[PDB]
Amino acid sequence: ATTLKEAADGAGRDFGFALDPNRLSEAQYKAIADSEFNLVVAENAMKWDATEPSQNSFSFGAGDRVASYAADTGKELYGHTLVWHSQLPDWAKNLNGSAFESAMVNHVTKVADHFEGKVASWDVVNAAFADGGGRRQDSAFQQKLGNGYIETAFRAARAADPTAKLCINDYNVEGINAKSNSLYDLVKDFKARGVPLDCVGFQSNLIVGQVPGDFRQNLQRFADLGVDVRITELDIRMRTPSDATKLATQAADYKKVVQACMQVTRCQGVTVWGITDKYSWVPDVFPGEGAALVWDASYAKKPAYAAVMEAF
Numbered sequence: 001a002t003t004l005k006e007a008a009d010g011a012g013r014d015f016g017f018a019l020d021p022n023r024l025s026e027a028q029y030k031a032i033a034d035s036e037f038n039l040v041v042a043e044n045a046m047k048w049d050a051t052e053p054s055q056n057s058f059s060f061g062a063g064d065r066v067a068s069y070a071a072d073t074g075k076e077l078y079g080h081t082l083v084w085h086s087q088l089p090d091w092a093k094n095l096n097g098s099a100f101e102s103a104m105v106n107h108v109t110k111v112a113d114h115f116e117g118k119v120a121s122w123d124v125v126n127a128a129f130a131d132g133g134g135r136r137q138d139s140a141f142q143q144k145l146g147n148g149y150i151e152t153a154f155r156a157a158r159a160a161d162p163t164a165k166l167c168i169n170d171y172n173v174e175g176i177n178a179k180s181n182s183l184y185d186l187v188k189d190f191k192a193r194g195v196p197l198d199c200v201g202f203q204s205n206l207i208v209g210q211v212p213g214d215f216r217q218n219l220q221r222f223a224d225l226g227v228d229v230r231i232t233e234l235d236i237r238m239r240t241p242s243d244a245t246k247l248a249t250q251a252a253d254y255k256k257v258v259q260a261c262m263q264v265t266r267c268q269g270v271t272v273w274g275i276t277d278k279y280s281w282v283p284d285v286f287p288g289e290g291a292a293l294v295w296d297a298s299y300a301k302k303p304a305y306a307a308v309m310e311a312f
């Protein structure tokens, strides 16, 4: 094809990106955003802190901008995220018992209700499991509400929006390990009990060369549970600077990940976390690392571009 949009389009898959609405005013960014993707998710606009800064005082400004961009260009809209322990506004953290549960339910209801009909799928709960299996210990949701907060959130989301696909999202669950084994048990139990859950999202903030060789097998075992699977946040960081060897590996890595999704009939698509390395979140949390995206800081197509196109 001519673009990754058409490559993905022809494969019947989604290929998305994390949008920062403030960047649509940089011509080069919009040009790429417009032509190379078929799905979009808000990078930060739809999180709890961005949407409910004070209790019951909602701010859908940035959220709507992203949603409007999707409808105006004809792209699918992915929602991220309703419940996530990180970046939980301070007012929520200081709540407890029923008052905390009430705030969670109200946040879920209101945010899902506002975007009803626009958002096709939602990341209802994000990062609930601990690396090493079991439930995340440092989550205010887990501490205050116990094991059942997840089922509560999913039931509230479905109550507010009857048609959006409800997904459970997590990172470091790409391969078969103790954390994905725990996730797998939650998904099996939910489907058995009739708890509304339609998909499983796999983050995938990988490092160049450390791509689990059993990605497919893992993606496929979830699919068999009766849910859709998707890669919700891809990037392959490296130690900078980069050279013709790091990029050539990373190019191979993108191809593996996209290729694993293609082999699982229920893998809806791949979503890359940004457009250009210029605005990547990596340098800020991983000092010394970066160059994780498909486009460099000068909007040049890195080798990974041709790899993703081939993978589709």
Ligand SMILES: *[C@H]1O[C@H](CO)[C@@H](O[C@@H]2O[C@H](CO)[C@@H](O)[C@H](O)[C@H]2O)[C@H](O)[C@H]1O
Residues within 6 Å of the ligand: 043, 044, 047, 087, 203, 205, 233, 281, 285
């Ligand atoms: C996958 O991890 C990325 C980066 O760690 C998250 O996006 C970033 O979130 C932080 C905090 O909310 C922001 O500072 C960045 O602008 C944003 O790119 C995803 O939310 C997460 O799912």
